[PDB]
Amino acid sequence: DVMTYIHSM
Amino acid sequence: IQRTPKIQVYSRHPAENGKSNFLNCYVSGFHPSDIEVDLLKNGERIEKVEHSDLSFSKDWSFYLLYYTEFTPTEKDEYACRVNHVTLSQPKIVKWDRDM
Amino acid sequence: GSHSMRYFYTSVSRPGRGEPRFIAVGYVDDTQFVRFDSDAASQRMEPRAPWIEQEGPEYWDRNTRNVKAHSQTDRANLGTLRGYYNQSEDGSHTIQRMYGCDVGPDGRFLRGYQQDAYDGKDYIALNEDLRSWTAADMAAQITQRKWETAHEAEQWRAYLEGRCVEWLRRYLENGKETLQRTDAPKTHMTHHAVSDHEATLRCWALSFYPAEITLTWQRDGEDQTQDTELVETRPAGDGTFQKWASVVVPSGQEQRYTCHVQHEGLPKPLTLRW
């Protein structure tokens, strides 16, 4: 199960 | 900098003439990921070759497996031709049944 | 013993050409089970293991939604990091991300991780505590301050200690047959004359799982890396792995040399002699 929303760099 | 591929050409099982097998070309340790890998039978590119999904190792270098089903004979020579930005000409590695 | 779940993301900018390409792959231990490719036609997370096919349509809807979001985030990141480093729009650049979790033999959470690379070099990593960041350079420190303010570590910690471990345990259960197996190496030796004076001894390990293995040569019990060649462990194509180690020895002295094979599926290490 992948990660949820990832914050931009 | 850029990292040149390590190349291994090999069979899934020790080769027996007349018995179905798989021909593998495993390229690893390279960067960037853009690469072309072709399997050759007597110098000629084999048409239907599959490959694994792009992944990479702990040091961030990429690896891929290219493969095709084949039946070894005594006469046929096989090779893997690897085209990468680090290589002025494609590197052609011959299949050795004990490597 | 222990197990792991890992996702590997690669994003590559294609200047002159179209959008950057994003490729994601998921593994449990050394077995891949899913893929997403932003160039493929389906535009869905796809199965790549028999035991993931029993997951319902909601599984695939969620994993597609989230990994598609990741792909847009990593495309945004390529232009952002090009700006950070003051690089031209002409060159191709790569963002890689690895993340996942380990569980012990009891199935309890051991550790989680998330680390990012730019052009094959470390960029920023989540620290072991899953509460702080280690940045590699000045550009990465901009990202670190952004993620500190956004409480990005909390999001990852809650995932790595929660759904990562819960869904890994589920995969290990659903794929007991594949994932909780150990395949001991089938071993043999070959022997080829180099000349009258020398010969090559090659020690083979075939058909083993997991990939972790040690091949070593000794001469009269002494560790021997002089004249030895060790190839990288390689996939057989059928879910097992292969490795060999060779040494060049004086003809007639083959008896002095032992190959030592260590693998999780071997209750005792093997010694092979020609």
Author numbering:
A (entry chain C): 1 to 9
B (entry chain B): 1 to 99
C (entry chain A): 1 to 274
Show me the paper's own sentences about this structure.
MHC, also known as HLA in humans, plays a crucial role in orchestrating the immune system recognition and response to viral pathogens. Similar to HLA-A*0101, which is one of the earliest identified HLA alleles among the human population, HLA-A*2601 possesses a similar characteristic for the binding peptide and acts as a prevalent allomorph in HLA-I. In this study, we found that, compared with HLA-A*0101, HLA-A*2601 individuals exhibit distinctive features for the T cell responses to SARS-CoV-2 and influenza virus after infection and/or vaccination. Furthermore, we determined the crystal structures of the HLA-A*2601 complexed to four peptides derived from SARS-CoV-2 and human papillomavirus, with one structure of HLA-A*0101 for comparison. The overall structure of HLA-A*2601 displays the common characteristics of classic HLA-I molecules, with the extracellular region of the H chain folding into three domains.
To fully understand the specific features of peptide presentation by HLA-A*2601, we determined the four crystal structures of HLA-A*2601 complexed to SARS-CoV-2 T cell epitope peptides EVF and CVA and two peptides from HPV: DVM and YVA. For the other three peptides, although CVA, DVM, and YVA are all nonapeptides, they show different conformations with residues in P6 or P7 of peptides as the secondary anchors. Meanwhile, for DVM, the side chain of P6-Ile inserts into the pocket C, and the side chains of P5-Tyr and P7-His arch upward, forming the “switchable” bulged conformation due to different position of secondary anchor residue inserted. But for DVM, the large side chains in P5-Thr and P7-His result in potential significant steric obstruction if they insert into pocket C. Instead, P6-Ile with smaller hydrophobic side chain points into the pocket C. Only the residues with short side chain in the middle portion of the peptides (such as P6-Ile of DVM and P7-Val of CVA) can be accommodated in the shallow pocket C. This led to diverse conformations for the HLA-A*2601 if the residues with short side chain are located in the different positions of peptides. When P1 is D or E it leads to the pulling of Arg62 and Arg163 toward P1, resulting in the “close” conformation of pocket A. At this point, P1 is firmly anchored within pocket A. Interestingly, in the HLA-A*2601/DVM structure, the PΩ position is occupied by Met. The PΩ-Met inserts into pocket F and forms similar hydrogen bonds with the peptide backbone of Asn77, Tyr84, and Lys146, thereby stabilizing the PΩ conformation. This observation highlights the versatility of the F pocket in accommodating both tyrosine and methionine residues.
